[PDB]
Structure formats: C-alpha cells, structure tokens
Amino acid sequence: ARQNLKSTDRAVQQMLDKAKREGIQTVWDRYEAMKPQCGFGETGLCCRHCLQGPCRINPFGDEPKVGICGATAEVIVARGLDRSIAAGAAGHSGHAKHLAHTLKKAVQGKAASYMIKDRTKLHSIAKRLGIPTEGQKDEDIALEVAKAALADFHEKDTPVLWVTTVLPPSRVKVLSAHGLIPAGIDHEIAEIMHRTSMGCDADAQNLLLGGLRCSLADLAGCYMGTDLADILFGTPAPVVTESNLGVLKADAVNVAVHGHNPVLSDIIVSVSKEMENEARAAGATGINVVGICCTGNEVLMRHGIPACTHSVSQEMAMITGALDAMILDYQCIQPSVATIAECTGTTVITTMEMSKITGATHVNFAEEAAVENAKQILRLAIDTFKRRKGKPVEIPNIKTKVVAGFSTEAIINALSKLNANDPLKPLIDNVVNGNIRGVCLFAGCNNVKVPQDQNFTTIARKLLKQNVLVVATGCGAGALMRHGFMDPANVDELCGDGLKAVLTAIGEANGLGGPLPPVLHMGSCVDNSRAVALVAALANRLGVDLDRLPVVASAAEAMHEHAVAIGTWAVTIGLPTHIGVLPPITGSLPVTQILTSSVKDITGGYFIVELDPETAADKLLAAINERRAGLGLPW
Amino acid sequence: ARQNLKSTDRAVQQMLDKAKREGIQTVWDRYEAMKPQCGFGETGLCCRHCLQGPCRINPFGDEPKVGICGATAEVIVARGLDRSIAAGAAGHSGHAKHLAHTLKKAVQGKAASYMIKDRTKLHSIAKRLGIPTEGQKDEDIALEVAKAALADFHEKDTPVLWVTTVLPPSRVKVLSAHGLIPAGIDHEIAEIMHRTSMGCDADAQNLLLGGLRCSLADLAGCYMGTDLADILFGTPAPVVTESNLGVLKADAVNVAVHGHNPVLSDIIVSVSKEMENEARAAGATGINVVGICCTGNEVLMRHGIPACTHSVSQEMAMITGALDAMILDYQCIQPSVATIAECTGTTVITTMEMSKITGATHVNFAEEAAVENAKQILRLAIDTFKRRKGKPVEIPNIKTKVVAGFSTEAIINALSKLNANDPLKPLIDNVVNGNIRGVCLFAGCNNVKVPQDQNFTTIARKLLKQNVLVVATGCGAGALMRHGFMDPANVDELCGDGLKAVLTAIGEANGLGGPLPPVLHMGSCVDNSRAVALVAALANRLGVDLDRLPVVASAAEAMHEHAVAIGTWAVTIGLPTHIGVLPPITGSLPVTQILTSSVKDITGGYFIVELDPETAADKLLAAINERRAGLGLPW
Numbered sequence A, B: 001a002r003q004n005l006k007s008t009d010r011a012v013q014q015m016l017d018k019a020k021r022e023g024i025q026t027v028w029d030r031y032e033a034m035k036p037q038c039g040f041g042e043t044g045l046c047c048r049h050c051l052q053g054p055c056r057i058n059p060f061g062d063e064p065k066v067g068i069c070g071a072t073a074e075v076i077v078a079r080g081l082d083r084s085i086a087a088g089a090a091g092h093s094g095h096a097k098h099l100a101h102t103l104k105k106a107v108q109g110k111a112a113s114y115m116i117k118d119r120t121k122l123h124s125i126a127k128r129l130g131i132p133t134e135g136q137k138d139e140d141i142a143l144e145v146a147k148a149a150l151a152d153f154h155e156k157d158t159p160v161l162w163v164t165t166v167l168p169p170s171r172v173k174v175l176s177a178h179g180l181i182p183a184g185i186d187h188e189i190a191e192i193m194h195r196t197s198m199g200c201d202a203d204a205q206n207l208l209l210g211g212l213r214c215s216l217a218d219l220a221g222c223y224m225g226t227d228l229a230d231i232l233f234g235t236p237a238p239v240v241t242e243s244n245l246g247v248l249k250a251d252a253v254n255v256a257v258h259g260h261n262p263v264l265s266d267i268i269v270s271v272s273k274e275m276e277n278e279a280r281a282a283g284a285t286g287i288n289v290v291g292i293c294c295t296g297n298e299v300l301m302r303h304g305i306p307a308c309t310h311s312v313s314q315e316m317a318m319i320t321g322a323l324d325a326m327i328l329d330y331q332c333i334q335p336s337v338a339t340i341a342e343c344t345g346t347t348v349i350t351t352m353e354m355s356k357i358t359g360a361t362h363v364n365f366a367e368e369a370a371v372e373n374a375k376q377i378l379r380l381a382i383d384t385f386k387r388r389k390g391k392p393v394e395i396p397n398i399k400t401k402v403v404a405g406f407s408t409e410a411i412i413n414a415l416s417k418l419n420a421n422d423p424l425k426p427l428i429d430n431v432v433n434g435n436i437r438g439v440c441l442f443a444g445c446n447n448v449k450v451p452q453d454q455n456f457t458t459i460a461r462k463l464l465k466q467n468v469l470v471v472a473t474g475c476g477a478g479a480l481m482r483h484g485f486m487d488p489a490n491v492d493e494l495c496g497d498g499l500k501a502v503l504t505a506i507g508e509a510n511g512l513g514g515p516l517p518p519v520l521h522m523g524s525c526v527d528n529s530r531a532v533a534l535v536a537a538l539a540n541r542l543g544v545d546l547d548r549l550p551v552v553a554s555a556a557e558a559m560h561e562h563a564v565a566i567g568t569w570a571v572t573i574g575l576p577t578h579i580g581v582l583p584p585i586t587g588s589l590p591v592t593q594i595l596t597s598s599v600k601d602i603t604g605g606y607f608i609v610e611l612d613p614e615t616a617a618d619k620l621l622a623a624i625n626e627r628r629a630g631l632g633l634p635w
Ligand code: SF4
Pocket: A047, A048, A049, A050, A051, A052, A053, A054, A055, A067, A068, A069, A070, A071, A076, A197, A198, A199
C-alpha cells in the first residue's frame, strides 16, 4: 500500500503501516469504503429541508430538474451553503461565548484559576470598543469588555462591534451599503436557519447576501475569541518548539490536548508542571503535554507546547501506542478516537457538556473547579501510563523545528526594530520595491480527499519562491510546520532573494542572528482574526480598503464548516480567496458565477476554486499581481 | 388520471384536471419526477456536515457502515434531526421576534398603524412575567413586555421566561432536572448548530437531549408569537366563515394572504375595506381577501377571512385564473408560485427582506409605512383584475362552513357559561364521566407523500366517534375545515353520543341554539401554544403534570421543519405525539428507540410513528386510554 497517496507526512505514513498490520481502521479506510461518493451531494444538488424530501436534481440530463416545492438548483445550492456558513459561525462564536463567560467569572471572583494575564491587551480592546478605562479598576474594565462581548450575540442599539470596530471605516461603509453588517451573532445564525427553511427565501442573490452577512458574524466570533483568549492567557510572542509524532516520548506520560477552545487545556499545561513528581512516582520521566489541532495551536503559540499532529491524521498519534490520554473539548475531533482507544490503550476524555463521544470517559469541567478537574484528568493519564509500563511503542523518530508565536502584536513589534515610530512602513516599503510581492494567508483543515498537506506545501513553495510573505493558521500552519516551513534554517532553500532579504533583516534586527522563519504562524482558526488585524492595519496605514491590497487567502485543503465560514468572510472583507477542495456549489452555474465573479462588484473579494495546487498557485499569484498593478506597482 | 390519489379535496381535484389540460406542472408532478427518492436521505443515513462528505451508511448490508470521520448511524441521524429542530425554532422565533419589534415600534410612536388592541391580554401577560402594571401606562407596560420578549432570545440572569412561566412548576422541575430548560432562544439554536458540526457532539443521547431543549426554544417562540399577535391584533373569539376554493369570486379582486406572520396581512385586511370604492371604479365588486396557510389562519381567527386553501394544494388557487394577487411573507410558500404566475396572470408579491422569490415583485414592507405599502400592494392587485376583465375563470363551486376562533380564552369563556367561577370543571367532569374520552390536537402541514388530508380526516373520524375532544391548528385545521369538521351541522354524523352531548351543552349555553363544531380551531402553528395554555391550565386545575393527562397530539401529514420542532416539544412537555410521515430516523434503531420509547422515562411523552391512519387512530386511542387508566378512570 502506497501510503504517500494518503499523506505526504512520513510519520503518518509509518503509522498507517502500523494501523494496517494491526487491523485498525483509519479515516483513509473509511473514505475508501465511501467511494464513489454521492454526486448529488458533492455538487450541492440535494435538499433535505423538509419531510417531502430528500430532493435531488440531476446536474445534467432529464428529471428530476427541480425540487418538489419548486426550489431550483440555484436556491438549493445557496440554502445549503448558507447553513454551512451558519454552522461555522455557531462554532467560532460558541468558543468566544465560552471565553466571555470565563472572563466574567474570573473578574467576579468565581473562578480563581483564571485571571487577567494581559493587561495591555485588555486596555487596548476596551479603548477600541469605546469602554472608558481612565480611573477604572482592571476587573471593572474586564467586566465591561465581557459584557460587551456577550451583547454582540443579540440585537441592540449598535451593530456587532466585533465587526464594525475591527475593519476600516471605508470597508464598514461598503458593507453597510449592501446591508451586510451583522445585527447580532446568534441573531444572524438564526435568521439563516429561518430563511433557508422550506418555503422561505428563494432567490440566490438574496440568499447569498445573507450568507455574506452571517460570515461576518463568524469573523466577529473569531476576533472575539482571540481577544478574550489573549486577555485570559496572554498574547503570543515568538516561541521555538517542535512538531510531528516524534515529540512523543516513550518514557513520559504523553497527554494530548485536542479540539479548539483552550479554556481548560491552558490550565492542563500549568497543572501538568505541578504533577511532575506524581508522574515520576509512577515511573515516568514527567508529563509530556502535546497538541493536536487548534487547541494544540493555542498552547503552542502561548507556551511552546510541541504539536503532535493535526486534522486528518489525528488517529495516528494513538497508533504509536504511547498516547496515554487525549483530552477533548470540541470541534474537529474524529469520533473514531473513542473506538480506536480500545485498541491502543489511550484514555480519551471529553470535558464539555455539549460535546460527548460514546465510549469516552467524561469529566464535567467547570471553570470554578478547573485545577481540580485538571488533576483528575492527569491522574487518569498517569494511571494509563502505568498500564503500559513494559509495552513496546512505535513513535516515528520524525520531528521538525518550529518557530511560531507571531501574533499581530509580535509582528508589529518585530518590524518596530526597523522603524520604531512607524513599524508597518518597512513592510510596505518592501511590498512597494518588490522584495515582498504580496501576502498569502493559509488557513483551514486537511481533507481526506487531498493527500495530506500536498496542496499547502505545493502552493507555499511556489509563492515563497516568488517573494510572497506567507502567514498561516490552524491546520494550514500545522501542515507547513510539519514539513519544515517554520524552521529558519530552510529560508535559503525555500525563499526568493527579496523575501529572504526581508526575513533576514527583521530577524537580525530582533537579535536572532538569523532570519524569521519562511512562514509566520499566526495561531489557531479563530486567530485568522489576527491576520485581519494586520491587513486592516496595513490598509489604514496606506489609506485604502482591503480590496486594493496585494493580500490573498487559501483554504487549500478545507474540511470543516468553520473553514467555509472563514473563506466566506475573507471574500466579504475584500480578499481573493482560494479553496482547494470542491465546495458543494458546482451544481449551480449561477451560484458559482456569483461566488467566483460577480461578488467582486459587491465586496471586491472573490472565491478561486482550484483543485490543482500548481494551477492554484499561479491563480493566487495572478490575483496578487493584479492588486499590485492596481496600486501602480511593478510586478 | 386519478386525482383522488393526490388529494381528497374535490376542489383540488378539479384544479388538478385544469392544470393537466393546460400543461402547468404542479407539486404532485414534481414529486412523481423525484421518485424513487433517495433511501439514504429518507432513513436519515446521510451527512453533509463537512467537505469530506457526502457520507452515507447502508441501512443494511456491507460498507459503507460509518461516516468518514467515524460518525456512527446513531450520531448522523441525531445530528440531522437536531438541525431540523433548530431550523424550526428559528422560524417560529423569527416570527415572534418580528412581532416584538413591531410592538416596541408601536408604543414608541414609530408605527402608528399598529397599537395595543387587547389591553386585557397585555396586562395578563405582564402579570405572568412579573412585570408591574399597577399605576403604569399601557404603553410602558407593553414596552417592558416587548423588551422581555427580546431578552428571551439571549442568555441572561433568568432562563427563557416564555418556557418557565407557561408550564406548571412540576413540569418545569422535571425539565430542569434533566437540563432541558433553554437559556435563550437564539442561544439554543446556535448551540445546536455548533454541537452538530463535524467533530463535536457524538453521543446519541446527549445530542437528543440538546434537541429536546431546542424544541422548548421553539415552544417559547410559538407562545411569544401568539401572545404578541393577540396584543397587537386582538385575541380570537368565535367566528363563522367559509373555506375552500369556492370562496374566490370571479367578479371581485381576489387577494390571497399567504405565509405565517400576519404583521402586514392584518393591515391588508383593514386597508382592503378602505379601497372598496377604488376596486369598484376598476369594475370589480370589491376586494375579496382570502387566506392561504397560517397567515390565512391568523386572519380567519381574528376577522373571519375565508380560507382559500392550504399547504400542498396552494398552487391550485392560482390555477382557477381568478387569483389577482398573492401577498407573501415567509414560510411554507412553494417557490413554484412565482413561475406559475406567468401562466395564470397572478401578481405574486414578496414583502420581507429575508424572503424573496426570483421572478416575484418585491414590496419593501416597513411597519412605519404599513398602510402605504398595503395600498401599493392592493393597487397592483386591482391592476391585475383589470387585465383579466372578460377572461373566463374556473372556480370550483365547492366550499364548507367554518366555525372557528377558539382561542384558549374563548374556550374558557364558553365553559364559564356552565360554571362561572370554575370554568375548567365542566370539561374535567365530562372527561371523568367518559362523555369526553380525552383530547387530541391535530397540527402541522400536508405532505405530498400522503393523499392530501387523508390522514387528518381518517384519524379524526375514528377519534370523534370514540368521544375524543378534537382541537386543531395550522394546516391540520385547514384539512379538517375543508372537509366539514368545523361545521356544527355535522356533529350528529361525526360525533359519539357523549361528545355530542358536551358540544351541545356548551353551544346551547352560549346562545347558539346548536352545538359547538366537531373540531375546535385553535389557530395558526404558533397557536399550538394556545393548546399548551389549555392543557397546562387543566393540569394545574387537577394538580398533576401534563404526562398524566389524557391528551395526545398528531402531526398526521407533517412536512416543514417547524412541524418537527412542534412534535418534539409536544413530546418534551409530556404528550404522546403521533407523526404520520416518516421522519429521517429509521436508519438508526437506537435513535428510534429513544424517541418512541425511552424518552418516556425522561419527559413522559413519546413519539408514535405510524403511516397507516387507521392504525394511528388505534394507537392514539390506546395512548389516551392508558392515561385514563393511570388516573383510575374507566375507559
Ligand atoms: S424544501 Fe423543497 S427541495 Fe427541500 S426537501 Fe422540501 S420539497 Fe424538497
């Protein structure tokens, strides 16, 4: 079996061989068993929005040509897409809502394990929202910030401030003119679900405008999540760590944190240090906390916790035999982990009331008891380590060096070493002179349909050679880190001369003796909001809207509904946005034409649907170079 | 072509013959073109919640057996069902939210076309919510009521009051013990969408408990909608009118109001009276406003507007050639009406920003301009009448007499003529002595899979002969009214002797010289909340919870997501609840077992899935008689 057709990650390939030997079914096996997949679903031409369904429409040929109620292909496709956007917004904003409640509990004396760790971030957010700080206690400022966060979920006398205060006024004006500013986060999610139900909205343009507005509700949830997590846990600054399965240690208690919301896993990190002695009494060397998915990104960015794996390959960490516990919150967790655990000996633990998995142990985490819960959890992990004393394990000896922690604050600070009072100017100077062709954000998941990481690395290599500044979040950052794109030792190999010169100048001015890494890791999926903050700051410094900047995005291997939401708000804020898997839109030419072309006339952004990564890189470079030409720059 | 296999309504059959002659495609034709429908979708064994899909599971046989991410059949089915519940809740609560904003605008002097029409209802709601009224202006009380309504959409220091203040304390306690009381209406909708996204909740029981809680958010939206519409437009009292296509008049301007929210169509009713002269200047006899679907129910209940048709047969009103305008809000409107209008000459007008139909004329209704908008709309209708002067029409000369307007206030008032200070006691006395075997609520839609009305009338006939008091809402009321079940002249034919005696006693005590009708029309789909108010009042008067009462529900021909939500909250509040179409659950035996059996141990209610209506009636009678036996009553 040619495992490189499943994943380009050599540690994953090794574990796929072990899973095959041992008869453990993987995500790739379940994908093979699903083929050929339903073409009605793949093209978007299926509707189950009422009990007269299921309805389907033949992409081509004879009947059925229309839904039972009269819903056309255009309507069916647009309604389906809208519900996916709403689902994504619901996830990011549920994460943000949880953090808002945590901050409120902390400053009300109800959860002493949590606190204001970043006072600077708290005050800047308060100022951005218009919350007075002068002569106020920090706990009172933070209570007002948490209350403002919660207020953005519902209608009120202002629109969603985590949209209108984070984008330039000119962009807010464009969006307002088209009716796209969200009135409340959960309000928009509910309105989507209403308008897409049977016998309601049935005009493709009207439906899709609703979708764009709900995608801005998702952006607000992302930005709110990043803001609150930085207040609570600290704004990231540059860190050095490692990635891939070789970060597991046979002689340690290996504990993975997995999911998206780090409200508990940040505590796990701190409590694990306190239980090192208890782990060694059990015969381990210590407790080795490692990350999976975006919760892993959160603790990597703030604490340098090494990242074990990501997304599609998450089961492989368990296949080593050395994963003693997998501590779950929610989002992007394959529920197969609970069954695989019976074969690998891993203790899979859920912690959130609305995210349980049959067969996994549940610990009822509460912020008020976080340290207590963390000790209960780590003691299960220690017990599990004890059960495998003397059992052989197979950890691939494969890992990469990762430099990360590039929050927007950290990037501005790094640039400030080149120009103290105008830190964005050195970046803009090098865009203008061509040393930096443009900026590309890689975001989103892996997807079993795409050999793991192949689109991210293929596209990134071409862009880096063409002097594009590449930033990354989520499992796009995961893909790039596991293939060495966050190791500064690879700048010479990967980067064009102009980009190398800039990365070197910034790195050497920050006391590194070497360049910044080839790709800047800006954090988790909610931390796509950090990229928005950087791009909005560049737009404001230049006096233009985002749809004039040479900035693009690529969800090169997208999977989750919240990647669909992110891609949609990237378009809505003005960016050319590549997606490297087929979204369920191709069954409607009119909807595809809106999303890939005529939306440019509304927001200035547009989707670029391209499954071939070499072709996608050329298309992204053309989009960047079109923006350069619109600014009168050489390219 | 045997049209009685499509609809049991003889006027619909006549129009199906006309549509066939004229080559106009109908809902039944589009259904035939869809067969055979996808069995994966029909059984619930399909998931499109991420871009790795579509995933399907064979009900029986070999692979695929599990989703790509590991999602089991139980998880896939429960997630799909939860999203349908959330969609239903989003519709009913969007309707309620609209009315709350309308009331607020009215009492703030911003929409003079609206007002407090039912001061008694306003004060009773205020008292139920704990809002002080003594020494307060009505406009201030109503502002506080509207603000409370809007607050129930989001988290706050109280749970959703339109749940906790409308059910008995003992029922609230049972629900609270299981974690089922909603925290906020839109909060629960968003949490469903989150928990059902990829890699989140993956335990069938946990998912379904979430669904039960979101169904209570739907109940709150229903009850809020009824409360606010009664304040604004008046609480229904008994009315006499007619139903079926024969209510159209060739010589008049025929204007249908269609959808669910009557915020504009109540205005249309009043403004149409003012434009009678203008209609006659155009050569019509007047303006003939008729109802379709639940907006039609709203104006039938409050004003006696005749109901033209319902649900699955809505296109047939247009096929007569006499429908000059169809005025749309949202929900349950087949979008085919916009295409059929090109053939029939009808002017189809949309009015709500989030519900447009390509090819229909849109009028941007605003409460602040409601009368202005209504005149613009009725002038389009008058112009359309003028275009058909001299054209032959085919209106089936088929109509029934309808007695309706049985709000819970009206029912209590009618009973009070038999016992002035204890009005529920005569009803309970006759349940105890067996003259009334129990109560059955018919609710929900028609569905093209079921010959139109056949389940409603078959089940109702059997129950009425067994002395069941039958109440009805929505298009269940529509089905029963169009077959004579709301005409008191049919009591002798349809009703058992004990039920006839009770209907006669109440009718004769209310100065009718005749009985109440065989079935009591309690209004629109949101007005299922009225049935909750009646049943909760009976429970309180008897000192028991709802799951001890001989009360059942039947969504005998269910279609829309909000019928799924209603059926689910009927179960959650404690009722045996029949559904007469297959919901997409049969692909999971564990989920089916929870919903039809083990949920009894949680809420005391349960679903009864039965597609054969004779069998369903026997099962409903067994459920009623089991409740009678639990109270120690003969049966
Ligand atoms: S909403 Fe229309 S297209 Fe969708 S399942 Fe129902 S009848 Fe079919």
